[PDB]
Design a binder for these strands. Structure first.
Ligand SMILES: C[S@@+](CC[C@H](N)C(=O)[O-])C[C@H]1O[C@@H](n2cnc3c(N)ncnc32)[C@H](O)[C@@H]1O
Lengths: 75, 88, 106, 92, 97, 328, 93, 108, 97, 80
DNA sequence: ATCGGATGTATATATCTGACACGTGCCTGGAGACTAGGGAGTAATCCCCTTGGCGGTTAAAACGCGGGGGACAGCGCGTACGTGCGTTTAAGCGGTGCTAGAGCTGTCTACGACCAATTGAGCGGCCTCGGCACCGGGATTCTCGA
DNA sequence: TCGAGAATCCCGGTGCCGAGGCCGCTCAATTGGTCGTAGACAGCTCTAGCACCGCTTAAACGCACGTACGCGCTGTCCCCCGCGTTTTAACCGCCAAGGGGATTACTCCCTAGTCTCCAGGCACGTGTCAGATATATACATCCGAT
């Protein structure tokens, strides 16, 4: 299924995913599409950030959701 | 009271005009034209700032507040013009 | 045996052991050799005699007996073979050689 | 209790001009000059001790450094006095 | 009838009169106020033990003298007698700054 | 042992003056202060200047007690006459009006002369250390206010308030919600505790409402102040001698700020010609723009040569543009 | 025998600042002498700097005092603002 | 035993830290070399070589070529002015000079 | 035929030799000069070839800087060409004589 | 044995060397003073090279010795 | 300012080559854990040295007025040097052939770090006195109007 | 070429404070022993510096010839020096406070040194492609001409 990730610049990116994929695979797909390294990505939805070891199904995310992406520095 | 550290400002005029003329007569010129008396002040300010900005670092490294004469001798040794007669 | 300093076997005047204690604890190498600081004291004594002879020679010619630093200044720069060792040294209380250019004379 | 090179310069002065003394500010100038020449010669012998994969400044590296730092005239007299000093120190 | 030299011969008295002597030339206490004003930066107040101030005066006097003794050569080279700003700015560029 | 009791224009809290005057430098007197207050309150409302022009002028007698006594005794009956006029058919001046720039400068100078007693003691510190003290003038802080237009939803935090005239000028200039100033070493903070009280009393005396502020004492490298740095709009630091050690830690703690924030400093955090490539992502310079202010004179009070002030901004779109244009 | 160099580290740091531009051999020798010369000058200044205060351990402060003396008045700020970021991340690990 | 992880990776550097340590010990610069020093020294050397190589690659890309040849290094060192005073007395081999003609020698 | 004005082939040789980066002095005269000047010291040297090339690059980078300085010192006299009393001024201001 | 080889540095090569620096017209007396300056500089460099390669008791002037002899005078040379 | 001839410089493709990116085996220098001895850190105390202020004396800086020597522009001439051309010479590339000498390895005699015992060479404090700065008074030297 | 007058060397008298020398006295130089190892010396393989020879030709040489510029002269004006007069702050001597520079003692944690383990980096092959050379061509530049 398609979901959207809304960044700050006005651009909306749409990825095709399944609810059972891990977040690492989502970050890898975004890295494939836009070239942004996975370590810099901090995804936020409904005031709660997502953890590396959990999945989209753990947070009750659904079809046609809108996610917010912010950029953070490297370490 | 008033502010701390009564500030010294606009003090390049200490190297006055006949003093620069005397310094010229050491070198072996005859007539000094009417426009050396700014360029000599510029060159002197550049040289004193370029020595003091090394002496202050050499005296920061020991964490003391007195710029001692050994620090001026070392900072002049690092630039190229060494200086005898002061213990270094 | 009787204590006898290392200068006397050298036939020198500068001290020998001070140069040894400076060359070891100045970190110029790891192990400082034996025959070297004698040679170093020798070259140092010859250099300071070569300066002080010209210093006193230009000190007697100016009707004084105390070597004032101006005599040292007029003794290094008037020579030619020592001008390339102190070639970027500004001796304090020094002054310049007496020099007027050839065009400025009336 | 700081050191100086005053008394040996005062000793070597008497072998040339036996009736003239030197002032204090000239003594400090000679004290700085001997210090600077010793600093330069040992600092050149150090860098000559690393371009040959050795580690002992012996009595040859000082001679090869003195034939480089001093100019073309004084070097002959410096080496012809230094080798006499070491061949006098050996026979004792 | 009031006696007056030719303009251009008091200077050739002052050349010998200042080359013979060896006193300090720039006035002492304005130079000390200048060298305290340059180090008035770096915020922390400094102290300037007086032997360092005199050492700095000897060094900052023995740098202008060589500059003028070189700019005299640069001014004589242009078949002129006096010096001028475009000779100091030549000597400082040839010197390597 | 007598006093020189004045009277305030609006309200009633008369400031007092003991007669042996506090000594200043060789040309500054407290008579200048009292005559300057009288001149500024005459410039405030013109009816007092109309009562001031007749029977007396601005000139003085400085050593005599009775002349300044007559100054106060005429000024007090002048204020009482316009109090009687103010209870007639006219309505008073509006209390919620912020003052102008000159009245603010005179009030800040008055509080700084009255509060601290021996200002030579401020130079007692540790050499070449973060603990060093250097004051910023009134004029550059006024240009700082008039440069960035701060709105009703901002927070002004002053890292390193010093004695703390900076937060006073900010709280009297704009109209934000709250303000903060934090400092470590106790010797300026003990003067700051009296600076607060004297500023509040004098801005009550002139009848000028300000913003809110709390001159706090702490240490901003502990974990308490990290979330409070990262929740604030505009930050005023003065780090000309902080060195590189705490500078990197401020570089780390600035990274969690919001969007549209601003940071000013006497030393630039990110360089002016900062290019961006695939190596220096770890620095904070990749996500901020810098711009040099106007190098005007009278800037600091440790030298006379002017220094720049490098207004920053947080703008996270440069990283987005670079990561979009990596693939082209 | 095998001789030391600085080659493959310079080639590694080139790829982080440019994607696909390699250096020729005689440029590799030039950078191999340049890094050696800057390291020689910095250590040779910090040696005499740790000698005028009668200490004997060239610590992580002597390099920070010598770098603000050797390099000019613009590169010094970036040199120390990278050196502190190196040492602070070295300790906290 | 733990897993062997090199010191260059612990600080986020690229130049070898251990090589710089072995050079500061054997070079007789002091008696004892501190452990906090050679990380800082490797970091300063790495910043300087990045600042040269960025301008070198920029001048190489401007002249329609992809290999950096030493003429590009000469055209990148001398043209900037903040890197001139550090390299103020070097003559880079196969170098060449900047393109420079004075203002008088041009024809009228 | 066609003949250029005197003073235009030089201002093309300026660009043609500033754009390039080759060596200028021919090799086998330079190697014979170095081998002949080294006969005054210790006898029967050998001169490994990379040292000869290094020495040539140094000997070119000396004269290019000397000529680029003496051109400034000759432009200062409001002349265009150079002359021996400009090299003998630049080499004295530089501090080698 | 070789002698009188300073005439290898010919006339148009010295003209080319002057052309690289940015001059326009070479007068007719530079072609002696430039040969003099070159002879002084090469003597003052090789007198520091042969001593360095004599200290190791070998008889070949290798390139590292020339790099050290130039590093002592003031013009240090990279690329080796 | 406007225009054509003629020459050089830069811009657009084709092949062909040797120098560069890269993968593999492998050795030695880097890393990990542990222990011992000292250099650096920190606190307390003395006391010498730097700043601050004042008041008197007066050298030297500040300012203005002639006026003469020199900076500077224009002009005219005569050599010296740029530019091109025909004759000429070593520069340079390759190829062969030789060997002195750079460079690595195996010993091991001699040479210098290190430490306890000993003491005199050399450093600070304190004295005496004369070489030398100062002053004033003529004797000689230099400059400038006639 | 000679007189007037300002400057400068010279000669003798006078007081002073910075060198020469002498004396406690302590800690760094000197003697006399070990013991570990850097380096003098021998002996070996083999890289690469040297001398020579031939062929192609790019470049060093001699020369005619024309011209832009180096250079000397004359003339103008402008600006910088000499000197007298009037401010001002430089300098010397004195007095007084206190803060920082040097010092001493006493801990303690960073860092040399040792042993063991192993992968990071270097030499070697091997492919392969960035550009060096070559050729055809459009645009800019210099130079005569209008
Ligand atoms: C340059 S002053 C700024 C004073 C005032 N805000 C201004 O701009 O004029 C820096 C101030 O920061 C304070 N400060 C320095 N280091 C600090 C620290 N580590 N924690 C808290 N305050 C500190 C000092 O007390 C000092 O007053």
């Amino acid at each position: 299924m398609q979901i959207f990730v809304k960044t700050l610049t006005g651009k909306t990116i749409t990825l095709e995913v399944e609810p059972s994929d891990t977040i690492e695979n989502v970050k890898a797909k975004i890295q494939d599409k836009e070239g942004i390294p996975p370590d810099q990505q901090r995804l936020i939805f409904a005031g709660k950030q997502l953890e590396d070891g959990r999945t989209l199904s753990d947070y009750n995310i659904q079809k046609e959701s809108t996610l917010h992406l912010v950029l953070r520095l490297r370490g | 009271a008033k502010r701390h550290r009564k500030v010294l400002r606009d003090n390049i005029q200490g190297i006055t005009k006949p003093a620069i003329r005397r310094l010229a007569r050491r070198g072996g010129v005859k007539r000094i034209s009417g426009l050396i008396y700014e360029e000599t002040r510029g060159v002197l300010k550049v040289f004193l700032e370029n020595v003091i900005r090394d002496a202050v670092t050499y005296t920061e490294h020991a964490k003391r507040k007195t710029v001692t004469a050994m620090d001026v001798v070392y900072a002049l040794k690092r630039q190229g013009r060494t200086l005898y007669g002061f213990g270094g | 045996a009787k204590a006898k300093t290392r200068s006397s076997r050298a036939g020198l005047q500068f001290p020998v052991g001070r140069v040894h204690r400076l060359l070891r604890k100045g970190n110029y190498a790891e192990r400082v050799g034996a025959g070297a600081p004698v040679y170093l004291a020798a070259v140092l004594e010859y250099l300071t005699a070569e300066i002080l002879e010209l210093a006193g020679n230009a000190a007697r010619d100016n009707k004084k007996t105390r070597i004032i630093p101006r005599h040292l200044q007029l003794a290094v720069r008037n020579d030619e073979e020592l001008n390339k060792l102190l070639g970027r040294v500004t001796i304090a209380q020094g002054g310049v050689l007496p020099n007027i250019q050839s065009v400025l004379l009336p | 209790r700081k050191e100086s090179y005053a008394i040996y310069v005062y000793k070597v002065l008497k072998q040339v001009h036996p009736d003239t003394g030197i002032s204090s500010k000239a003594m400090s100038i000679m004290n700085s000059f001997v210090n600077d020449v010793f600093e330069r010669i040992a600092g050149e012998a150090s860098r000559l001790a690393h371009y040959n994969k050795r580690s002992t400044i012996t009595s040859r590296e000082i001679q090869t450094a003195v034939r480089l730092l001093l100019p073309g005239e004084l070097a002959k007299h410096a080496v012809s006095e230094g080798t006499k000093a070491v061949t006098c120190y050996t026979s004792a | 009838k009031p006696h007056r030299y030719r303009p251009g011969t008091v200077a050739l008295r002052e050349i010998r009169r200042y080359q013979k002597s060896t006193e300090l030339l720039i006035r002492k206490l304005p130079f000390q106020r200048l060298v305290r004003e340059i180090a008035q930066d770096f915020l922390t107040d400094l102290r300037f033990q007086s032997s360092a101030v005199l050492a700095l005066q000897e060094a900052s006097e023995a740098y202008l003298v060589a500059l003028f003794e070189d700019t005299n050569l640069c001014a004589i080279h242009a078949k002129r007698v006096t010096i001028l700003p475009k000779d100091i700015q030549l000597a400082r560029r040839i010197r390597g700054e | 042992k007598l006093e020189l009791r004045l009277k305030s224009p609006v309200g009633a809290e008369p400031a007092v003056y003991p007669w042996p005057l506090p000594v200043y430098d060789k040309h500054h007197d407290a008579a200048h202060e009292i005559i300057e207050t009288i001149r500024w309150v005459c410039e405030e409302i013109p009816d007092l200047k109309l009562a001031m022009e007749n029977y007396v002028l601005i000139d003085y007698d400085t050593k005599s007690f009775e002349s300044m006594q007559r100054l106060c005794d005429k000024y007090n009956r002048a204020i009482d006459s316009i109090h009687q006029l103010w209870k007639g058919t006219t309505q008073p001046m509006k209390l919620n009006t912020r003052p102008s720039t000159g009245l603010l400068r005179h009030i800040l100078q008055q509080v700084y002369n009255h509060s601290v007693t021996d200002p030579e003691k401020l130079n007692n510190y540790e050499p070449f250390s973060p603990e060093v003290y250097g004051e910023t003038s009134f004029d550059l802080v006024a240009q700082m206010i008039d440069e960035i237009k701060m709105t009703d939803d901002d927070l002004f935090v002053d890292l390193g308030s010093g004695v703390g005239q900076v937060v006073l000028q900010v709280a009297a200039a704009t109209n934000c919600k709250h303000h903060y100033g934090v400092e470590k070493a106790d010797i300026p903070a003990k003067y700051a505790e009296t600076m607060d009280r004297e500023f509040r009393k004098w801005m009550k005396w002139y009848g000028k409402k300000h913003a809110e502020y709390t001159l706090e004492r702490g240490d901003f490298l502990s974990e308490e102040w990290r979330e409070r740095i990262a929740n604030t709009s505009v930050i005023f630091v003065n780090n000309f001698a902080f060195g590189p050690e705490v500078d990197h830690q401020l570089k780390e703690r600035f990274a969690n700020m919001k969007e549209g924030g601003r940071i000013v400093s006497s030393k630039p955090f990110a360089p002016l010609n900062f290019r961006i490539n695939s190596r220096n992502l770890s620095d904070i310079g990749t996500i901020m723009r810098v711009v040099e202010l106007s190098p005007l004179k009278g800037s600091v009070s440790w030298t006379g040569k002017p220094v720049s002030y490098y207004l920053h901004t947080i703008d996270r779109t440069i990283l987005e543009n670079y990561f979009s244009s990596l693939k082209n």
